[PDB]
Design a protein around this ligand. Structure first.
Ligand SMILES: [Fe+3]
Ligand SMILES: [Fe+3]
Ligand SMILES: [Fe+3]
Ligand SMILES: [Fe+3]
Ligand SMILES: [Fe+3]
Ligand SMILES: [Fe+3]
Ligand SMILES: [Fe+3]
Lengths: 280, 284, 280, 280, 284, 284, 280
């Protein structure tokens, strides 16, 4: 059994309203507020949500959810963890219900990042995704997860071995003291996960989200320029994912990377020395 | 040169608010309001609009706009009308501006229905379609027009001839027995892949327009619309069903102007060749 | 080895003639009467039959037949049952011949439902399916079974484990005391089997049958309206199978669900809270 | 490891010239005579030959050759035979060279039929197949073998178990004392092998060969009528292979079944009670 | 019979070396030098060339060459020009040789822009395209011509009519407010799959040509070009963006003659039918 | 209405036996002998034949047969010839029988080459093509004709005009320097998917025909033919190579009548539009 | 784990300039000179290089690199070697960096040929392949390796067993004392490797490189004729790969075989007695 996608992210945020303007108003996500006093959701497709916003007054990552196919696969994965010596917790039904999933395992990666493994997300088929701003197209999520994240690790090699155990595949992809970021995938998305990018003040460095239509990235690019917001990396392409993407600050003080046209991971490992173009 | 699609409809209404709730809130169209005194717009795709709503107090059809490919084609059609001795007005640039088109000709069909032929609709490709209720998919319009309409014609043969001149094709599609032994023979006509764009010969009518069909790309949006209408007790005069001709899955129901909208899914193209039916397939 | 489809159903019925009018006259199945004094068959495609009508004077389920690929797979499955502690019976040749199959294993599921596992159904290739009323198209059966059934179970978890052992895959699909129906598949049909829907007076709740052509469902819908028969659920869509279907009473006092446009099961487990539209 | 196709047949024949008129002159096979004093070959495609004609004065089967993918697969298959208790002989290089193959295992099936297992047939790529009469099209052989054969067995069940060990798959396909012919396949050809058809005077009952073009079967049908030769079964279709074929006597006193439009074997076992049409 | 593509451009330049560095060194074109005194060539595909560079001292457009399918088609177009009372020169074999074509007619458009119509370009299929900087892919030209241009026209309606005669199709593509309440209505026209080959009506211009669009098959080549231009501080007058009409991803920037090149990727075809816009999609 | 393909060739030969060995034994054609005194046939596909061999003592081309779709089309072409004042003979049913066709017209091209136009060739669909040496594949002929030929024309422009009337399309395909400063401009023409069916303007010729190209579906048959020719020392006057125009892989070599056959593989279609070359791609 | 392609070759050469004229000037490869004093590279596609030219004054093979998918596969392959008794060396990071790979295992085949196994080649995505002469098309390398090589072995059977252990598949393909060349593949390229061709003065007999466009082979054929260079085998086709190729001398005194239109290896082993055409 292997994880199949990056299913959801929990975020700790200090300012819900600013996140509404940003994620729905600019990025085109749908705000879902089910009445809960301490959280709201962000929806990108059929699923009830892909991202949870916990208004706990912090501004960092709360948890990463990795999907598996069903209860049998969840059990096989739990057993693999037990055999590897890795502490985990089979969540109760009520804890799974909090996450809007049927079954859920909670644990941590070797960098201390809260990591969850689940099957059976809540899908709202009867209430179509309705974007928070006008969209030409949709988001790329089908079988591919919500996007990709760079997260903090203190032991790159331990993290890699942990993530291969979960089912992800990958290796170092750039050589840039030579530093060696590692990139990993579990489906057709080039990667869902990367680490070893150097010292980081927060648990998460960025999140790349992907549009089906190029016109939606331009629409977002222009809203960000009009709203006169911080751009860290300009429009361009990495050698690895070969996607067209830009990097801007979110209300939590880290980066979102809205994108278009990401390719699949090569079936065999490669490594690069530099990006294709842009990203200035 | 011929008409290529049913491009837009002008509607006279007496209650804008009801229309907004109906067309956007249930059907999923986008309300476009340009700050005009007397009118708002309904949008279904990239075009600035497909339906104009003139808040004038009446509840009927105001005008029907038929698209042609371009200026040369508009000239060619104008000359054909003149050579048929059909009167028409060459609209100026301000009349074309008012309709959001590049050029147009204004006229009447034999039944007195105000009829426009235009090229160059306004398309808002910077502001994508944003439906007025959540939608699963979109509207079927590309190269097919807004949908199909049923309109009043006192002279069926005169209307048939008028619309063959414009470039529409078709003929009688159904035969049915009337009370006195007569035979009703409604005429259905198309100008593109859409089974038909136009019909008439369905008998006496108190308004110029009887119904409008609009088509969803996704059945679940038809399902959704149906559900809100049941939630809000609107008159579905004809239940879910298939006509023999268009072989579409549709339900008929009442709009705020007192006539019928027929939301539908899965319309088939107009056959290569003319055929007719005595009855429909199922439902309705 | 795994079961590949829901191959056949045996029904106990009190009124054969009424079943002829219903299943052939309305639904478009073919009545096959081979001279046997206590039964007649219903045929939907190439197979000799998909359903057996036993005129024993009862009005419920008699047996469920699950197909396997051949004698080797039947043996591997019998061995899996022996290893699990589940009593079974390898039918004799004459018992297999009664069912019109080459090899047959008889047993019961944990709810006490008679369950059969077979290979090699009788197929009448030289006598084409001829519908009991005029049909635009056909039934959807190829590699997909005859349709799907909701059956009674007293132990939802035991039933699930039993059915996974047989080769089916699935889980809970709706949360609606929270009740949790389970749905299962063994091929491209969304599901062949569901249970845990609540208390049931009979062994079987319904049977969904599927038309290739939409026009055939309308034809049946209209015959049911003309014959002024009981409709329990109106035309609509479940979130899970995303099929267009209606629910009406059969002469045995349970439901048939004639349908159109059922999709495959998602490759990974999901759960819903409500249907898409209709089914009032 | 499994056998992949029915690769070649060795025949013992009493009259080479009559076989030339028949197989090349009517059927459109190519006569290959490499100078050997006791044999000539029949070629149907790229291979040097598909059939060997041994002029030993007998009129029956000499051997059946089953192809495997290479030397590794040949070894795995030899090992499976050793483990099953089945005597075999690894042919020497010179014995393999006689057969025009690189590696060859000789043995017998439970009915005593000489059976060979080989890899690496001689292919004459530089000398295109040239038919013995004018042909519209070609023969169907690619990845499918030369055709199919009914052979004699005294123990139907032993033969089946032997043939499954070799890699073939199948079961009984007709019920017609009820007799139960077994049909087996190892590729896209409906079957390569059948037995249990009742008492037979010879080792082989027939050989079906298949044309790509319908017009070639008609051409052969007409030559057979003009030459006023024996027809046993008229043009028609079996329920199982669903091919269009006729049955005529060859100069050895058994049947050839020239054919067209044979379908693949169903992915799951079926059984019939009668043919579709024809074969009178 | 009609023009089929924008085949070549003749350019007057004052500095060959700068052009070589710009067109080849950055854009990826191949410099072709045939040992002529006064001119070199720029190549983008199998054709001997798409752009001629006459080192005469001026910095402007010299001529525009439009392709037709063959000799019969050239005759047919010649007769149409004559029947319209438009003057033209039938070039001799040496004039055709100079242009690397089999036949041609020379003339002027209403704005005085030297205009040629030809069949039979020279194609060097023994010496494949070899770009002047490493390229990921190639240029989009097949049956689409070199790209599209914006040129000076004092009389927009006269030019429109002139180019409909040649066989191009199109009309006004945008409307925008001018200072005095006027409406600018630029005309965009096509003769093949390329959205447009030609535009004008964009206002006063000091040179005959305003810009040229060239299209890469691969985005990474657009990316590459963009990067070298940033490395060499050339004026990108308009940043990465999409026009509503061609829906292409392009950036505008200055060439050594003082006007604009617009390298681009992913242009869409010209719609079956005329439509217009009030604004563009994004960027620029 | 136009010619659709080069249908057949009539050849005068002085040695049948050599031809049989060459055309069948090496090229893979089928010899068809109908028991006629004076002639045998060469077959390449379903047609009774593509080449007639008249054993009359001369070694040259006898006639060229061009196919049209049917009788109406033959009439239309006949009337076009008459309206051009080109003389022709309407063949009777026995003349059509002799050619194995349903109808035909007989005439001359400007260079005196006997020229026939026919519909309805005889097709032997009961006796499939059986090649005269083992073949891997077949000949390319469907809707493309037998191949292409080079023929003698004293007046290139007159011939061009003659063949545009018949319905062939094309123009000059190459330019090359002659000794005296002149320019040779051979004309290549097509009437279907085959790059060309016909060429001329290659200079002085002692026979009416210079070469014939035939095309194999499979390269291995080209390879096979090449090998037998090397085994039998026939003159391959031009080695394996690609022309710029047809972009085919072919080798030229001598037949028993003293002129050239060019067996080939992988010919490309004639481009949508006319283009020309100064040289060829490789080899030859 | 198996090797996936013939990734790179190291060559020892006496004359760098002559190799530049040959490989770039004629063949259309790109010369990459990164400043190193003892070597330059030849590039054929995205990779930094496919061939290394070591100017050590010798004129033969230096090493053969076989690609594997990643570090896990490299480990599984290293373990297979340890289990087989075959000495190997896990290269250090700096040794892998010298080769422009992320991980590297060094060893020898049974003929003494230096053999390397690596994952993660350096790819220069931001600097497109730019040919050393004008090219119509490109080289065929994607998932197929750089081409194929005939190398020297003293023990044909040992070499075969060694190469099957690495993941390659194959056997004897020609019978021509009967000699028996062996051909092997690990992807869609007919073969990457062949040996047993008879006595050889050098470690490598030839290298076949493949063009996507036929016109590029003709362009090279003509440059070789104009430069009036040695041709050993004329244009033609082998029965096995069915490619169109010619054989000419390189500045190191062995053969390059520029080619076009090579087919995949047959899924099952064959053997031939002669080539199709040409190669005189
Ligand atoms: Fe990223
Ligand atoms: Fe309607
Ligand atoms: Fe159901
Ligand atoms: Fe048979
Ligand atoms: Fe532009
Ligand atoms: Fe030629
Ligand atoms: Fe080779």
């Amino acid at each position: 059994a292997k994880v199949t996608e990056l299913g959801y992210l929990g975020l700790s945020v200090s300012n819900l309203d600013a996140w509404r303007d940003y994620a729905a108003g600019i990025m085109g996500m749908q705000v879902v507020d089910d009445g809960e006093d301490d959280r709201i959701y962000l929806r990108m497709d059929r699923w009830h949500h892909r991202i949870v916003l916990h208004a706990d007054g912090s501004d960092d990552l709360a948890y990463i959810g990795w999907r598996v196919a069903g209860p049998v696969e969840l059990d096989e994965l739990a057993e693999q963890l037990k055999n590897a010596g890795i502490p985990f917790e089979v969540a109760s039904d009520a804890d799974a219900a909090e996450r809007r999933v049927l079954g859920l395992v909670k644990l941590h990666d070797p960098g201390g990042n809260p990591t969850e493994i689940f099957y059976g997300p809540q899908v709202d088929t009867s209430s179509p995704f309705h974007p928070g701003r006008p969209m030409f197209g949709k988001f790329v999520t089908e079988g591919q997860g919500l996007g990709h994240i760079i997260i903090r690790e203190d032991d790159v090699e331990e993290a890699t071995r942990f993530y291969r155990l979960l089912g992800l595949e990958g290796a170092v992809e750039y050589k840039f003291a030579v530093g060696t970021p590692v990139f990993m995938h579990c489906n057709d998305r080039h990667h869902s996960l990367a680490f070893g990018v150097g010292p980081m003040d927060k648990r998460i460095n960025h999140l790349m989200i992907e549009y089906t239509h190029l016109d939606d990235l331009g629409y977002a690019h222009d809203l960000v320029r009009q709203q006169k917001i911080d751009v860290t990396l300009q429009i361009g392409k990495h050698s690895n994912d070969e996607a067209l993407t830009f990097y801007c600050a979110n209300p939590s003080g880290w980066l979102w990377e809205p994108g278009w046209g990401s390719r699949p991971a090569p079936a065999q490992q490669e490594h690069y020395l530099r990006d294709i173009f842009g990203h200035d």
